[PDB]
Ligand binder design. Structure first.
Ligand SMILES: C[S@@+](CC[C@H](N)C(=O)[O-])C[C@H]1O[C@@H](n2cnc3c(N)ncnc32)[C@H](O)[C@@H]1O
Ligand SMILES: C[S@@+](CC[C@H](N)C(=O)[O-])C[C@H]1O[C@@H](n2cnc3c(N)ncnc32)[C@H](O)[C@@H]1O
Lengths: 236, 236
């Protein structure tokens, strides 16, 4: 039911299921070639902290994708969807009814707090030290800036990401959008995450053996057939 | 009047003087043994961005003070006041009529957005990975937390500093507190900063030669007596 050594219990189940109930699948960040592992990690961490289920990345090149890989996998509870180009990502995100906000200084750029983050929203962050591409700018609905009232006129991309995600968290919390009886996530995503998060080592074993993820009940116990248990316990 | 090569002109003067008019000397952050240069730098940068004139640090040990020194000097427009102990810093800041907010999880801790940042305020940030000291906690007026709605329950100290400083910037901007005809800074601080910021290389030369800083006029020109100019130009 609950394998020895594993942390799962009725309480950790509750904590996980409450965390999924708070998940905001219509809110995301998209990293346009943001590739330094410390930035990718810090951005994912804030994404989790404001209830983002999935973040997006444009890592065109193989070295960029590989350097970023461990950081991309640093959080069991945030998946990273990779796109070849900003055209593909924005198409995909517009496809999900999301407004596309480009973190970018221009004459048309608006204070990031003037935005309604309670609607489906993608926050677009650009690279060190070059900013979002002209192509991305052409696809975005609106430029947003974080006002800087001193002499410096640039922030690190992790700090800028955190500030915009937490303005979304503020407005969503003020609108009560983290208080939910059920997750906005489909039941299948919730079971995937309960297992892949709750039993991260067993989820890898299941994948390698090409087995389905089993059901997890409110005790946090694994419910599966003798055949699943036997295959999962076989070498290796 | 304006030495050759220097950036100062009537426009850079305006930008500097408008920046001093926006300065919020009753708002600060105090770093309790926050010593990693990347964190000290990133915290100072956000401090500048929300109008902080002076930040505070508790760096008890000589190696901590030295490792942090370049980061402490990374921004011409933010001074760092060092204190031997948290007792000395909090005494000094309570002395300036500031409420002391400890970034710290407890049963008594309040959402950081519930705070009135429009009043004199010190944000107290604690070290990696240990948090604010029990002694600091005993001196603080109130614990604040940044709510984290996912599984992770910790942010990097630079990201947490940025989020609380920008909640102060939000509330201060909403109250119009960055729109001022004159600086809240004394005239003497404004001239110090105009010269030390506007002419950072000459301010060091003035100090080494033990000369006073001269007057800077609205053209951004240096106004000083033949004697100052002669001493400043002498070897070396
Ligand atoms: C030029 S990169 C900074 C370098 C990078 N963080 C590093 O570690 O080297 C800054 C990016 O963060 C965001 N950003 C930075 N400063 C900003 C500001 N003042 N307003 C809005 N967005 C900002 C933008 O997406 C921009 O592309
Ligand atoms: C434990 S240190 C993190 C390690 C350090 N940033 C590093 O580079 O290794 C976290 C500090 O940031 C602040 N902080 C972090 N997470 C926070 C949260 N969820 N709520 C409030 N403050 C937080 C507190 O001052 C705390 O002492």
């Amino acid at each position: 039911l609950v394998p020895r050594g594993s942390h799962m219990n009725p309480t950790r189940y509750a904590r996980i299921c409450e965390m999924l109930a708070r998940r905001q699948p219509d809110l995301t960040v998209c990293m346009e070639q943001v590739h330094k592992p410390h930035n990718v990690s810090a951005i994912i961490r804030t994404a989790d902290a404001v209830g983002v289920h999935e973040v997006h990345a444009v890592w065109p090149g193989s070295r960029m994708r590989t350097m970023a890989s461990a950081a991309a996998g640093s959080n069991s509870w945030v998946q990273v969807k990779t796109h070849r180009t900003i055209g593909d990502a924005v198409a995909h995100l517009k496809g999900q009814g999301m407004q596309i906000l480009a973190t970018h200084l221009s004459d048309n750029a608006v204070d990031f707090r003037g935005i309604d983050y309670t609607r489906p929203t993608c926050i677009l962050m650009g690279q060190e030290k070059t900013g979002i591409t002209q192509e991305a700018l052409a696809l975005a609905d609106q430029d947003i800036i974080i006002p800087m009232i001193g002499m410096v006129q640039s922030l690190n991309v992790s700090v800028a990401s955190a500030l915009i995600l937490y303005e979304a968290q503020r407005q969503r919390q003020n609108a009560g959008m983290y208080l939910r009886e059920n997750s906005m996530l489909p039941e299948a995503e919730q079971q995937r995450l309960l297992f892949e998060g709750g039993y991260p080592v067993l989820a890898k074993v299941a994948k390698r053996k090409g087995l389905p993820y089993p059901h997890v009940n409110q005790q946090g116990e694994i419910e599966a057939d003798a055949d699943w248990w036997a295959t999962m316990q076989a070498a290796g």
